[PDB]
Amino acid sequence: VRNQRYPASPVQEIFLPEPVPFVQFDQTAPSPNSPPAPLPSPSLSQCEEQKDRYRDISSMFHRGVAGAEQVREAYNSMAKCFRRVSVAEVLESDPAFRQARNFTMDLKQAEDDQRYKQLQYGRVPSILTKYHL
Amino acid sequence: SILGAEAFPELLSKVPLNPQMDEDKHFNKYKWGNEPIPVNRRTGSRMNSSIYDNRNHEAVRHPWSTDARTFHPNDNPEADRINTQYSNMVSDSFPEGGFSDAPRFSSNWERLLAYHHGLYSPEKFNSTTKTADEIRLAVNDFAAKVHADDPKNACKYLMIEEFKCLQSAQARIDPQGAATKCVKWFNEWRQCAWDQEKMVKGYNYIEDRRARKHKPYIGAPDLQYS
Amino acid sequence: NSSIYDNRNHEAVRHPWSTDARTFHPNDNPEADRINTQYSNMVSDSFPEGGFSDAPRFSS
Amino acid sequence: MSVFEARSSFLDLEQCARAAGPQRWEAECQGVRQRALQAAADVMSRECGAYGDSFFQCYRHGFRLEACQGEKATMQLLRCQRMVADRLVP
Amino acid sequence: PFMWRQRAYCAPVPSAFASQQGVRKPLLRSNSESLSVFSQIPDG
Amino acid sequence: SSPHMDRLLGDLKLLAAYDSAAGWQEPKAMESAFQSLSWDDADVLKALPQYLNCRGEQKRRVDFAYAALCPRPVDEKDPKQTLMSLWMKARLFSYDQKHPFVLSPFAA
Amino acid sequence: SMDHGMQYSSIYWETSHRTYLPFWASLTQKFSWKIMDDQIRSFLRLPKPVTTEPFVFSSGSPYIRRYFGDADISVPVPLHAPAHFAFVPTGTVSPWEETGMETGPQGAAARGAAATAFRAVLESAWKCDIDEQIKEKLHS
Amino acid sequence: SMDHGMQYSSIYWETSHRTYLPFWASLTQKFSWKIMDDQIRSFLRLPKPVTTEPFVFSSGSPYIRRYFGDADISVPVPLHAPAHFAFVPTGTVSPWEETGMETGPQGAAARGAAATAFRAVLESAWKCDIDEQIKEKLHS
Amino acid sequence: TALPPPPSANVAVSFTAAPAEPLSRGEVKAASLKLELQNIERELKDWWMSRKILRDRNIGLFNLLQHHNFAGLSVNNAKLSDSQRVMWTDLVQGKPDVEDKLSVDAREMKVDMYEKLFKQAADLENPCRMPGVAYLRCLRDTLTETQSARRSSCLNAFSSFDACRTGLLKQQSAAVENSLVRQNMADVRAKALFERRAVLLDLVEGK
Amino acid sequence: TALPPPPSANVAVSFTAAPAEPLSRGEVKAASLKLELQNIERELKDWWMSRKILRDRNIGLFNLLQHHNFAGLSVNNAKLSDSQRVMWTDLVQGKPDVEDKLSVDAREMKVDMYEKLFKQAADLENPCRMPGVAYLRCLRDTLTETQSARRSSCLNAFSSFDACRTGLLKQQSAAVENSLVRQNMADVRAKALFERRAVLLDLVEGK
Amino acid sequence: AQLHASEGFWDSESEQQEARLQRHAEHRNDLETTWEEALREATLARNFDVLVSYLNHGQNGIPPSVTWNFNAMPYGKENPDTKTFPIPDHEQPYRAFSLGFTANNLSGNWGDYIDRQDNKNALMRPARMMFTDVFIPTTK
Amino acid sequence: AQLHASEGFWDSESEQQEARLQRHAEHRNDLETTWEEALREATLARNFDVLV
Amino acid sequence: AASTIPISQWPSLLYAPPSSPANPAVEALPEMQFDDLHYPRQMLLCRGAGYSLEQCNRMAQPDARVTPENPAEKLLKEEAVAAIACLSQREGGKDEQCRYYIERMYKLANKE
Ligand SMILES: CCCCCCCCCCCCCCCCCC(=O)OC[C@H](COP(=O)([O-])OCC(O)COP(=O)([O-])OC[C@@H](COC(=O)CCCCCCCCCCCCCCCCC)OC(=O)CCCCCCCCCCCCCCCCC)OC(=O)CCCCCCCCCCCCCCCCC
Ligand SMILES: CCCCCCCCCCCCCCCCCC(=O)OC[C@H](COP(=O)([O-])OCC(O)COP(=O)([O-])OC[C@@H](COC(=O)CCCCCCCCCCCCCCCCC)OC(=O)CCCCCCCCCCCCCCCCC)OC(=O)CCCCCCCCCCCCCCCCC
Numbered sequence A: 001v002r003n004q005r006y007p008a009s010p011v012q013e014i015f016l017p018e019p020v021p022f023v024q025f026d027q028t029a030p031s032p033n034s035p036p037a038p039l040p041s042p043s044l045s046q047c048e049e050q051k052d053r054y055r056d057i058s059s060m061f062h063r064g065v066a067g068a069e070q071v072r073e074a075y076n077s078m079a080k081c082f083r084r085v086s087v088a089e090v091l092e093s094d095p096a097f098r099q100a101r102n103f104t105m106d107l108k109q110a111e112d113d114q115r116y117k118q119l120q121y122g123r124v125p126s127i128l129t130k131y132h133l
Numbered sequence B: 001s002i003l004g005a006e007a008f009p010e011l012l013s014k015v016p017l018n019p020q021m022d023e024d025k026h027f028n029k030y031k032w033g034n035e036p037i038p039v040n041r042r043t044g045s046r047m048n049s050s051i052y053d054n055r056n057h058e059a060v061r062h063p064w065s066t067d068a069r070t071f072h073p074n075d076n077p078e079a080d081r082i083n084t085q086y087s088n089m090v091s092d093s094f095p096e097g098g099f100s101d102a103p104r105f106s107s108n109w110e111r112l113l114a115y116h117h118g119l120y121s122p123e124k125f126n127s128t129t130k131t132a133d134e135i136r137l138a139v140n141d142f143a144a145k146v147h148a149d150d151p152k153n154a155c156k157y158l159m160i161e162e163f164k165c166l167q168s169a170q171a172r173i174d175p176q177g178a179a180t181k182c183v184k185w186f187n188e189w190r191q192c193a194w195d196q197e198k199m200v201k202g203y204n205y206i207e208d209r210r211a212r213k214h215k216p217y218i219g220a221p222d223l224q225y226s
Numbered sequence C: 001n002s003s004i005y006d007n008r009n010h011e012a013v014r015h016p017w018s019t020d021a022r023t024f025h026p027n028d029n030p031e032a033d034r035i036n037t038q039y040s041n042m043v044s045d046s047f048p049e050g051g052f053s054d055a056p057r058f059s060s
Numbered sequence D: 001m002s003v004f005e006a007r008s009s010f011l012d013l014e015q016c017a018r019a020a021g022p023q024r025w026e027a028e029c030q031g032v033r034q035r036a037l038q039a040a041a042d043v044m045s046r047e048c049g050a051y052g053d054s055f056f057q058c059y060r061h062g063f064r065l066e067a068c069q070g071e072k073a074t075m076q077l078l079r080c081q082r083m084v085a086d087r088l089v090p
Numbered sequence E: 001p002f003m004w005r006q007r008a009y010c011a012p013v014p015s016a017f018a019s020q021q022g023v024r025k026p027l028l029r030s031n032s033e034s035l036s037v038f039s040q041i042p043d044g
Numbered sequence F: 001s002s003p004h005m006d007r008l009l010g011d012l013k014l015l016a017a018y019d020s021a022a023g024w025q026e027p028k029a030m031e032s033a034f035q036s037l038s039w040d041d042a043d044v045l046k047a048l049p050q051y052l053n054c055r056g057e058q059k060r061r062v063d064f065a066y067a068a069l070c071p072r073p074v075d076e077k078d079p080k081q082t083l084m085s086l087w088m089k090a091r092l093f094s095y096d097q098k099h100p101f102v103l104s105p106f107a108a
Numbered sequence G, H: 001s002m003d004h005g006m007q008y009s010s011i012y013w014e015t016s017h018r019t020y021l022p023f024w025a026s027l028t029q030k031f032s033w034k035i036m037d038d039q040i041r042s043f044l045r046l047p048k049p050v051t052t053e054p055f056v057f058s059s060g061s062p063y064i065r066r067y068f069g070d071a072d073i074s075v076p077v078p079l080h081a082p083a084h085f086a087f088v089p090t091g092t093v094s095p096w097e098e099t100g101m102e103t104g105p106q107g108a109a110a111r112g113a114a115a116t117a118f119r120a121v122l123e124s125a126w127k128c129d130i131d132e133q134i135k136e137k138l139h140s
Numbered sequence I, J: 001t002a003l004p005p006p007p008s009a010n011v012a013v014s015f016t017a018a019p020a021e022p023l024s025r026g027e028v029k030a031a032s033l034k035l036e037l038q039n040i041e042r043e044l045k046d047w048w049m050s051r052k053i054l055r056d057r058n059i060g061l062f063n064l065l066q067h068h069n070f071a072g073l074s075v076n077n078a079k080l081s082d083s084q085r086v087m088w089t090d091l092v093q094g095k096p097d098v099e100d101k102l103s104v105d106a107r108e109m110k111v112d113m114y115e116k117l118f119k120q121a122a123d124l125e126n127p128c129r130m131p132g133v134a135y136l137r138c139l140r141d142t143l144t145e146t147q148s149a150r151r152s153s154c155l156n157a158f159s160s161f162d163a164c165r166t167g168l169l170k171q172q173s174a175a176v177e178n179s180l181v182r183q184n185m186a187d188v189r190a191k192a193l194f195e196r197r198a199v200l201l202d203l204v205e206g207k
Numbered sequence K: 001a002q003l004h005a006s007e008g009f010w011d012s013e014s015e016q017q018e019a020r021l022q023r024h025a026e027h028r029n030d031l032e033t034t035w036e037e038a039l040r041e042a043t044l045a046r047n048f049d050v051l052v053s054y055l056n057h058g059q060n061g062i063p064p065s066v067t068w069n070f071n072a073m074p075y076g077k078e079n080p081d082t083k084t085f086p087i088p089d090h091e092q093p094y095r096a097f098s099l100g101f102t103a104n105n106l107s108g109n110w111g112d113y114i115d116r117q118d119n120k121n122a123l124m125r126p127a128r129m130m131f132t133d134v135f136i137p138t139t140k
Numbered sequence L: 001a002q003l004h005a006s007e008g009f010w011d012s013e014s015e016q017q018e019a020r021l022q023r024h025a026e027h028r029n030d031l032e033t034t035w036e037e038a039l040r041e042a043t044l045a046r047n048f049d050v051l052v
Numbered sequence M: 001a002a003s004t005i006p007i008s009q010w011p012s013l014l015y016a017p018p019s020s021p022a023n024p025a026v027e028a029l030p031e032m033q034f035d036d037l038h039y040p041r042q043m044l045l046c047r048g049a050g051y052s053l054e055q056c057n058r059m060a061q062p063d064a065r066v067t068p069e070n071p072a073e074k075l076l077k078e079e080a081v082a083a084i085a086c087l088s089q090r091e092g093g094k095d096e097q098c099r100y101y102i103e104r105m106y107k108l109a110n111k112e
């Protein structure tokens, strides 16, 4: 059942060993030098077919011919639609995110910064502080 | 009112927690598929190991009735073992869920008697394997305690190493197998103890003169040793 | 166990319960004069009169 | 901490709430509320601690064990909690 | 001195748990003496 | 009807899935896990900047709970790991400031 | 069924393997200078080893040598009946009992602080949910 | 650890033991007249055996022959699904239970009439003694 | 299905968690309640496991007997031949007798069938075997006769046979009744123990 | 000592002794009493066997410790040297300190003796080990000083040491008290069960 | 070596476990027999003090908690259960050398004293007699 | 001969007893696990019909 | 390529694990700690000092000797908050919608 990484293993592994992947981003495409545009702010205008479909499927599960997977899916879509507006309200209101919304920076500054020097993990205190010595 | 709506994102978004779940639920998000861990490696019973035992590769006998189907270690593993973490390595020598040889005692005095005769410890019988994180936490706490006990000790890291090897070999559930791995570090600690005592208390001996054939050949160098 | 074609020959029989593994030993080298040749004295050469010591006392 | 004590706590809560009213309840009835919630929490931990420990163990082992397969490890815990609540609050 | 039930090599011999035995032989002995050659045998 | 509990257990499952997929070299699975991690929770979003500036007893409680659930130190360089850690810590901070934690076995 | 066993493996000599024994080897015999050296040392009053002295100065605790028919064959034997000490309280441990199942501090500590913290977190989340339910029930 | 074993015992030929094989023995080969006899019987229409007939008259219950590729190789197989009968009552026996210990008729009968008779004799003797004691007590 | 084993501490706790103060009254009471609970659970387990094992064993026996096509004193088998059923019901409930319609050879055959069937059914330990064999032997003695003349001679054996027969039937009936009564008593006791456990779990105290 | 096994029938009884009539009310009641009795005997056996095993084990431990000449927090050993006893009682109850009368070499020797004794006594799992070792290390640091000057510096460590010490003592006391209470409760319960069995044996019926 | 055998050092873990089980079973049987006797006597006397007095009818020390044996010590040239740090080459010993036209010691490996092996390879093992000047076969 | 081996005719009495014990242990473990599950479910439901 | 690690090599595997797409801080793996004896030790010390159980529970505090905090949480604060905002708005960064912030963070932390 396994799909081998090296079907020609005594040849492929030595000649062309697979590398360690990179999951932060694709790395095969250009880097955007502009952020994403602010999406249109949402509201409860758009939960129509989610509210009514969840009502339908819940009434049908109350009958029993529906199932539970469907109820979970519908409820989670509806709740996502509500969470959109709740998150929009939080972002627009709470002032700590105003800087983050209008956050801008370029790769040149990212490469010129020097905060990477201070990224070392600290050191756990001594176990004698438990006995206060 | 449905139970657990927001609690199965693994189901809503087809996210497998492991390749076995991926294969089962047919999410097919693991590029390399899945080689199933067979049942003899997922569970089983403790066995005898030495070739100088007559009941070798036979299940260990207990006072209580126990399934005699044994855990089989991986003796012929595949070449590519994509996950070489401790999680996937430990399954080759122990079952993660522990052995299937645990008792359910009908009485408390049976438990007492088994313990009294050395045939039961819950530490050993009702327990899983330890995770790498747990092992590391234990080792680091022990190392801190030893460093506090004495910094100016030469056998320090040797004691830490025997502790580390016991933890890695899962001595809670296979103590005899783990001691077989760790007695070398115990022996090295035993040596370091005397080497320190003889350095603290000055102990030396009259060395004899150099032998006539200390060098095998005249053109050979006689590298000086302390 | 008795047969030579058994691997656990001359070994006690294993039971689900805990049992003393010291075995009854038949008389393999009996004396010449066995003054009592009645069944009472003969049966002791192959079985114990009081029965074996492998009986259980079940907790349930 | 016992079911009887927690039930009596919730009855104290409800009667003091009917005394106060829908407008000043959250102001007047904080201590009784905390006592009731703590007792219900003790009951929940006692009656659903095995399932929580099992979920914790499965999480440590990456849900690789036999008992971690499927969704029972989660559904058992959620069902225990639902049963405890239905037994206490109404 | 940390994992006693898991370190049997550093444990006393079974004759020590028995509470029964010019100069007498010692009552307490370890299994770690097996790692020495001239522990029990003489150096003659 | 049990959103806090449900989302907590889901987050833990997704963390475990991320770790397993990393061990098995599965970018698709681990990015799915990262994407499915409840980023649309207003309470946790509001509590994030509060956690980032808290100090003292509350911070120590939340750190203790986070080291219980996830004691491994993430790589300081991997922002996805850093962000999931921050999210879990913010969730625990929200739960603690609503109903504080009682971590001692001795209690009454 | 171990004594007086049969020959199980064959005995042989491979072709042209050497033997290193001459024809007078049976008349050859060994010899050690140790007996003569001992006699000479005793007669000339040369330095004796300390093994002739039964007391042992090589440790702090008292040892006495036990000789097996000769001063060359001895073992030191300790004389002290050593007192041992335990900075331990009695009756604080019942290892046969499984303690993860009993409810209490001893049980949580035979379990871990991690499990206890997880239990507390579940407790807090459950309390949040039940507080919401109480609020909506009593607003009605 | 059973397959592909080593030679455990030696192979040998004792001196002057005979072999009974000539030098053309490898060219010798066996022969049976059975095939030729069958052909001749079939061609001359000689008496056939009853094994050519699948039905079996050698018993009262119905048997049918099953052939393994040839009329010479057959086995009879019974056709009936036999009904079995038990002149036994259900639920009258519990063999796992020790019955010598329970008090009752079933217990005495799992024990013996000899033990029951002995018990009755002891009963009678005890009754005699207790009657004497009653007499002497009540005469006072 | 089972649960996973419980978690254990990674660092060794030796005695550090032991109590530094003697127990209190409520704690002692709670301990007593715990002991009561564990005794109750032990009793319930004994009942449940005995019931389960016996149910499984007896269903297996029933399926085995149905597989091998057995018939007992309660004739509850549908796969029987009508002739076999008549013969068995004669041996169990009615009177085995040869008819005057038959020829003497067929009477001999009928008696041989009766004897074969009855000897396969009843073993030497069975009490009714000797009376049955005696009655069939008397029939063999009296084949060349009419039923009216045969009755006078075979009645003395048929009486004993019928007696042993009815005794077996009464045994079966009594066994069913007694087993039902015992079973119901045990189940009622288990239910009461369960309710006692329920109230004690409502009263139990700790965390 | 044991009894011989009971006698068994020589002739095989299969079902001949089975009842041909259903049980009666008194018989059913007697059966219920028998079940109660066997449950009571099971409980008594559990108590007695646990008590016996624990008594034997703990007496064996006591004899072993007396054989190897051990001394604990409760100094209950007569074979001790007076010097060893003073040292141990200082480590358990009093304050270990070097006297100004001694020469610095003898002070070093005394501190080494304290450290050796305490390290053999307390293992790394012990909580008081780190405070004790720290206090003795401070004494080594402050050998060339007077007790008055040494107190100010070593007090901060002696406090933690004394705390862990008193904690262990309290643990021992609490353990003794709780074990006594539990033991007495169990014995009282067993006695009551015995009397219940006695009355049920006075009421039991049959032969 | 006889001292080691008293402690069970030459035994295997199966033998140690079997001895442990044997002690367990003997002790269990003693206990249950004593319980039967005690209950009988206390039932005929109707007194709990009798049961109490049977608690001291049978305590030298205890059974050992753990055991160590010789087969738990590791062995192997390549076994990493024996390797802590590499031993220097100038401290490792040399294998014997034999090379001539007639014989050598390089076409095979006999192994160590414990971990032995056949010097000859698989194709000539059946014909070992041909590589010998003398051969003394087995007894069978 | 293969039929005889299916019935355990070539086995020894030790092997027969071991197979018997193996079945016993498997059955016992199944039963005790089912009892634990049943008791847990019937305790959270507070109903005897669940045990049944 | 990824060959089996025998049991004798596991102690080195625990503190020098192989490379992954999600590695830990190997330099900080010896610094990860979580004390199971913290609260028992605290209680023992306080009860030996002479306090009551209630006083001990009021004076109890959680362990500071745990695994240290990630310095990225204090150095990359604003970048992380912006990334989390982007994720909350764009559904977890599906089809590469938070690549801007994530790449800025990666560059800041790595520097080639
Ligand atoms: C093609 C190549 C050409 C180029 C060459 C290239 C080579 C150049 C390099 C040189 C070679 C170096 C190679 C490396 C060497 C390492 C190998 C090695 O040495 O050991 C291997 C080999 C390994 O053996 P081993 O199993 O390991 O045991 C080792 C032992 O330490 C030793 O084994 P051992 O001690 O057991 O064997 C010794 C043996 C033999 O010992 C000796 O022979 C000692 C030497 C005496 C020689 C002089 C006496 C001659 C007498 C002749 C008279 C006969 C009558 C005349 C008849 C005429 C008609 C024919 O003992 C006996 O057999 C019993 C004899 C006891 C009595 C002897 C003493 C009395 C002497 C007087 C006789 C009186 C008898 C009276 C009886 C009593 C009556 C009352 O060693 C030996 O076998 C040693 C013996 C080898 C003998 C070889 C036989 C051939 C000799 C002729 C050689 C060619 C001759 C050339 C022409 C010159 C002659 C005309
Ligand atoms: C001291 C006591 C005095 C008082 C006596 C008291 C006794 C009185 C009673 C009599 C004794 C009865 C005792 C009881 C008997 C039971 C024991 C028994 O029989 O079996 C034991 C014994 C047990 O053997 P076995 O292992 O059980 O196997 C049994 C087999 O069934 C049989 O074994 P096999 O079949 O395997 O062996 C047969 C063998 C021998 O088979 C034969 O020899 C067949 C007979 C032919 C003889 C005539 C040919 C002569 C040719 C001579 C010309 C040579 C060139 C001239 C050179 C001149 C310069 C020397 O086969 C071969 O070796 C291979 C030969 C294949 C070719 C032969 C056919 C071609 C013939 C023409 C040659 C052409 C070659 C061309 C090559 C191809 C080129 C293209 O049986 C035998 O061994 C049979 C052979 C025994 C031969 C003995 C050799 C000595 C013969 C001389 C005897 C004394 C002579 C007296 C003076 C007269 C001659 C001058």
Ligand SMILES: CCCCCCCCCCCCCCCCCC(=O)OC[C@H](COP(=O)([O-])OCC(O)COP(=O)([O-])OC[C@@H](COC(=O)CCCCCCCCCCCCCCCCC)OC(=O)CCCCCCCCCCCCCCCCC)OC(=O)CCCCCCCCCCCCCCCCC
Binding pocket: G015, G016, G017, G018, K098, K099, K100, K101, K102, K103
């Ligand atoms: C990490 C890097 C490492 C790299 C590795 C580096 C390597 C290490 C570093 C190397 C550094 C460089 C060092 C240089 C290399 C070192 C080589 C070395 O050490 O050697 C050791 C190495 C062996 O070391 P090993 O550890 O002892 O090996 C096991 C033993 O060798 C096993 O022994 P065996 O059981 O197999 O028995 C062998 C037997 C072999 O002995 C025999 O072969 C005897 C056969 C004689 C039969 C005929 C005799 C007739 C005379 C009868 C006498 C009167 C009758 C009296 C009756 C008793 C005597 C028969 O015994 C002997 O060997 C005795 C040797 C002493 C006698 C030598 C005789 C020399 C006479 C030469 C005559 C010259 C005539 C020139 C005429 C020219 C033409 C006009 O050497 C060998 O290979 C041994 C064989 C040597 C060949 C000798 C053959 C002599 C035969 C002469 C025939 C004469 C007839 C002529 C006829 C033609 C005229 C008509």
Ligand SMILES: CCCCCCCCCCCCO[C@@H]1O[C@H](CO)[C@@H](O[C@H]2O[C@H](CO)[C@@H](O)[C@H](O)[C@H]2O)[C@H](O)[C@H]1O
Binding pocket: B209, B210, B211, B212
């Ligand atoms: C009936 C007449 C009897 C006549 C007796 C003749 C007596 C002869 C005795 C000579 C013995 C000399 O013995 C030998 O001498 C040399 C120095 O000279 C010693 O010294 C030599 O070896 C030792 C170390 O091995 C070192 O001192 C040094 O490396 C070397 O000089 C040897 O250790 C000793 O073995």
